[PDB]
Amino acid sequence: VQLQESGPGLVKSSETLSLTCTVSGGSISSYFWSWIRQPPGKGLEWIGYIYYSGSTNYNPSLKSRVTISLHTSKNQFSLKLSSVTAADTAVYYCARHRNWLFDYWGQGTLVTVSSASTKGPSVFPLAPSAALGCLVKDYFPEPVTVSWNSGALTSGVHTFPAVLQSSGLYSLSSVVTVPSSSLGTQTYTCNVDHKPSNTKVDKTVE
Amino acid sequence: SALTQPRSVSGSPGQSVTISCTGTSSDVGGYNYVSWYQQHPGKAPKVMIYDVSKRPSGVPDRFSGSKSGNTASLTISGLQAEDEADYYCCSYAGSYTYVFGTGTKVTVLGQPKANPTVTLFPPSSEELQANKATLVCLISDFYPGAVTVAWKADGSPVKAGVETTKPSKQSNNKYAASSYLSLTPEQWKSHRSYSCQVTHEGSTVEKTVAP
């Protein structure tokens, strides 16, 4: 049994999230068929399932917002989650459920919830008082790249993964650890490139 | 309420680890319908144990499961590289419902343990002029790749406005994580101090800032 989630990728805030799972290698006219998710944030969260008969049962905290339905003519089952917010951004997994366990899982699909349109970042300095950096705040969509001194500075650099904030906009940071006595003699510049908004920023830190 | 697992466990190749999974009499303690799932990055979770102690066909017998009262345990003997993954427990919770645990990363130790470097940056005056205030806690050069971050305002817990990233491998093979406390300039001004508290391998590193 193989399961494959399909879906919109991006959903606006307060819209309905709809996903489908197409099953191959066996029939959805046997057993239970379930959805589970994982916020980039937490572990797994069971959403609910549907028995092949059409009978459903949902996570008590999601029940009021959830519908799972069968589409047997295509060996598919679906999820509708109403009025999504930032807390619903997650990888959504479909899985077969049988004999008190979840025996076959899909690989999952990321749904991002954001009503944002394209926006380039504000880049703020993270000045030293030796570590220093750049806060690349409030951009959409991904991705941003960050270099330091146009590529010339690499040792002690790390650019962290983006967070998606409740605003529906992303932020990330990039930090560099440098020698204490370099602060007077040498400038440190983060080069932030956001292709989607056609924005490049060079910010020189303290 | 998600079932309670530890965040991180680790052991060397050939050695053993145990992962606990603590629920209640309504779930873990109420039935013998406890299963465990292994998840590699970007892969489908795989059932490793079901009904507390039973192994699916193909799963090596080095994986074993037990339960006492409200706590289930998964034990992985003779660790091999491929056992490095996230593991989740799951229980039947009554009235046709299920609850998953919070997840444990299992690390198979291939390099030296290391505690994080932690740097806490206050909001810049430039950001404050933009009418926003972001505290930025950057956490680098740790192994194994799992960390707990707690924010404090005047020493007491904060969990509004917190966003933390999952540890990422750096070019030097150690791990990095970031955390953000997002607030308004008046909220930033409404406390005497803020602290980012990072727990790793039973050790804490705390940095504090003030306006």
Author numbering:
A (entry chain A): 2 to 82, 82A, 82B, 82C, 83 to 127, 136 to 212
B (entry chain B): 2 to 9, 11 to 30, 30A, 30B, 30C, 31 to 95, 95A, 96 to 209
Paper text:
Among various ANAs, anti-double-stranded DNA (dsDNA) antibodies are a reliable diagnostic marker for SLE. Among the ANAs we isolated, clones 71F12 and 121G9 were highly reactive to both ds and ssDNA. The surface plasmon resonance (SPR) binding experiments revealed that they bind to oligo dsDNA with nanomolar dissociation constants, which were much smaller than the values of polyreactive 72H11 (equilibrium dissociation constant [KD] = ~400 nM). It should be noted that 71F12 has base specificity, as this clone exclusively bound to the thymine-containing ssDNA and dsDNA.
The ANA 71F12, an anti-DNA antibody belonged to the 6th largest lineage in VH4 sequences. In the anti-DNA 71F12 lineage, a majority of the diverse sequences shared three amino acid mutations, one in HCDR1 (Y33F) and two in the framework regions (P14S and D72H). Among the four 71F12 heavy chain residues that underwent somatic mutation, three (P14S, Y33F, and D72H) were highly prevalent within the lineage. Therefore, both Y33F and D72H somatic mutations contribute significantly to the acquisition of high affinity toward a stretch of DNA containing at least one thymine. Strikingly, 71F12 gained high affinity against thymine-containing nucleotides by mutating just two residues, one of which lies outside the core antigen binding site.
